[model samples]
Target: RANTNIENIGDGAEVIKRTEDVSSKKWGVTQNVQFDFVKDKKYNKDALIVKMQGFINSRTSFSDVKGSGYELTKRMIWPFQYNIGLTTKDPNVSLINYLPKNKIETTDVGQTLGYNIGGNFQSAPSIGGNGSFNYSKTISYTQKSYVSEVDKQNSKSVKWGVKANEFVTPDGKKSAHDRYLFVQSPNGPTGSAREYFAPDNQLPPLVQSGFNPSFITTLSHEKGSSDTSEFEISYGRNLDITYATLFPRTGIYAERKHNAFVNRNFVVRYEVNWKTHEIKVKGHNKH
Candidate 1:
């Protein structure tokens, strides 16, 4: 009997290394990924592009006077970033990055960008010209958003929420969770995918005002006044040294000084496209 020897060789080589981290103590997220690919005869498309995204959710309890008037506010900010430096090891077969014709493939990664602001406040300093906030409004590229007042109460005592990731909304629907932390995933569903923040307005005005105190904390000489505290919170995308620092702007005092006008609901009229379907939006107005 005679037997023929058979030979087989490897065709493609690829290795992907991805590590993620959610540091609760420090309240931050970090992910490191490395991809190694040696293009074979199949699956030979320019690897992929990275568009990393994430958000920061924060709340502030401002200037409580133990009984005068108090306010608690919360909001979220987002940061989106991109990198199209992926290349394959194969010289004969190149990915989309090798040619100028591949823009059709990289279209969405460049065009479709989203950044929204949502915030809520309770028992605000209505005594001052400051107590009104809207539930949600689609703002232009140059503004921040705030929410509406939920319940009208000069009631006494302190109360806290039992659940996290949510709070009551004006429409009496679900506990709004737009103010939560997250990272990555472009195709995520609504309320699941987070939004990015203003490229220039990196600093949150309310939180900045609250912490700085000189803005939100003040005493009022009004009839039937009670001692209470208030805090306007800040929630925005945690700035990354590499990923999100691309659109760096140092106008920190620009928004910080916005508090000088106090609380004023600027008229925000998003021209009705005749449909809430395209941007079926639901968010807080201003904080």
Candidate 2:
């Protein structure tokens, strides 16, 4: 008999629905098993497959991928579909123990230790030999000016002006008490000393003079200026000169103001002698 019901009864349809649900569960389990089998074969260990899958799935949902770990694996798996040679090593390992083997070294005079994968990778600075630098710097100072009133009076007492008319020389009239006018003469003391006297016609004997003449005018009101400099130097570790200031004798004069116009930072040119460990310095008013 050919049964011709266009629709199924309620129990009949219910039974059919139960059958389809069972089959769907079986297919899902089968597919999961197949996937696991493939991964196990490629990784050479069922344990590794479980570990990696767990690690990946723990960070993201198998049906709900999100965050760093899942995003990494998601992109990584795409390359595998095209037969990429990429494979994960022990993902549980830490890089802290393996860094020294890959570090690069600098080969120059100085070297620096740094990270290979960051901005820390840099070379060290070199220490150059002695005499490495040269330049000018301010070393000292100078002041120039007129003689004092006392000095002028002393010069006037020495018969500074109005030649002495008493004792005269053969060629020209000589100062009666002039001692410095002649090197050898009877009228005045010999040489620089006043202990002995020579005739006006004979050479003066060598001796220290009682008076030292000033080259500049002895007048208290004299307004001429003089220029001279004093230097302060630092020498050896224990030398006294290093602590004291030095000055030139030639340019210095009496009754004069010293360091009248002092420059705080006097500039000088200097160079270091590496072998001798000495610094050679030269000073000048201009650069």
Candidate 3:
């Protein structure tokens, strides 16, 4: 319990408030670079390829013009099972962000990070690219950890998989390729943990694009050629998911432009993870 009072012993009463006027500045930049070492090598009937790449990203936006903050992320790939690879035939699916409650401490919060260093052979075979069949392989390891702040305990997970992929085609002339993804899920697997997962990217047909005939619309269709109609038909659909929820809170703040980007995915994610009166045991566990 606590109490407080003001005692100036003045004839009348008055109130005053004040704020300071200040200014700030910010800067941002982005740089991308790539390099290739050895080309694909042929061993007996198969081949062993060698390649490497590096990336860098930096930003310094108008950070309230205050101090500053920055972050950097990178990735690399090579030959199958031996390096990293992706083929046109491989399934083009998005990554997941699914998380589960702590088995040890039901009431807790957690996080985990992991890295994958490996390669994939030809997995998805696309005749459009060439007559050569697609084949690939990859061997990689990944690890993640979670925390139960309330219990002052944590849990860890690990996975190492070697996968070989190939395509089956009646026409041997068509190339086949299997896709192996050696991913470093620094943030852990992502997908709906619940039975009812959220739908894929949802957006207005011509959201980013202006009110142009190129974008699909339920209102009315503009006059054009048969090719134009086909193109317009492929424009937007209920299944077409856009990448917008990845923005930060400030990006979605009220009156901000990014608010629309926060679709059902954001709302569901927030509902599942929000917590109160929860704590993780750290430092000395002794009470």
Candidate 4:
């Protein structure tokens, strides 16, 4: 005879008082990877010149499970260029790597090395070309994302450039020149340069008196980053061809948590040249 305890003991069920404690912690290596690429192209008046450029960059870092991480980044900028009055105060920064002003120049974070290309053209009376200057600039960047030792994932990138052209007469005559620039979406901080140039500032505005008038240093200021700005200025015989014009300079700028160094980024580039049917290309690089 067997006493049947219907609900007494379930399948493999023990009635003894048991205590089981399980301690678990995530132990994995954190990884950080990055990829950066940029392309720039421009056409100008002198020789119907075209400048196409590209760049590739990479960075690798490490992190621990407990909660600390390290990062080592390597960036490369290719085919960047800036004119006399285009980039910043000094022309050296434009010629070399895209880096801080003289005050911010260093081998570790300065410009590496790259190639350059250009074409000079001329349009004479017998051979009348379009005589219309055209230039275009485009910049694109991408960063990879993944899980790292730390519980954080982020990708950051910034690109500022332009596409433009200008056509001048063979006889030292001016041509119609214009500028179109773009700034990033999100906004950034306003620097002393911008603040000083604010619409209604305390001092008088800088002016270019004549075709050969020297640049007025007092009014014009320079800051390297992204700012949505548009301008168009033309000049030539009777200023008929609009020697200079900046259609629309756009700025696509933003500020994020990860970026601790600079809360904002801005960029400004321009090109001025000549030709009588003799195409000439000079000063080309990345910024």
Q: Rate residue 177 of model 1 by lDDT.
A: 33
Of the two candidates 1 and 4, the one with more favorable lDDT, higher being better, is: 1
Clashes of each: 35, 20, 44, 70
Whole-model lDDT per candidate: 0.19, 0.17, 0.16, 0.17
- Overall local distance difference test of candidate 2: 0.17
Using Cα atoms with residue i matched to residue i, what is each candidate's TM-score against the true structure? Answer: 0.20, 0.10, 0.14, 0.16
| Native-to-model Cα distance after best TM-score fit, residue 194 in candidate 3, in Å | 37
Off by over 4 Å in 3: 1-34, 37-120, 123-253, 259-287
Q: lDDT tens digits, residues 1-287, model 1?
A: 02322112133322121212121223222212111111123332222111212222222211111322211111223222111111112222222211111112211111221111121112222123332332111111101222211111112211111112222233332322332222111233343212222222333332222111001100111112322222111112211111111113431111111112212111111111111111111222332
Model number with the top TM-score: 1
Q: Cα lDDT for residue 232, model 2? A: 18
User: What lDDT does candidate 4 reach at residue 187?
Assistant: 28
lDDT of 4 at 191: 32
Which lDDT tens digits does candidate 4 get at residues 1-287? 03311111222221111111111112111111111111112211111111212211111111111323211111111111111122233221122222111221111221111212222122221112333422111112111110001111111111221101222222332211311111112223543222211122211111111111011000111232222212111111111111111123533221112212221111222222211111112222212
Rank order (by lDDT, best first): 1, 4, 2, 3
Question: What is the lDDT, from 0 to 100, of the residue 226 in candidate 2?
Answer: 19
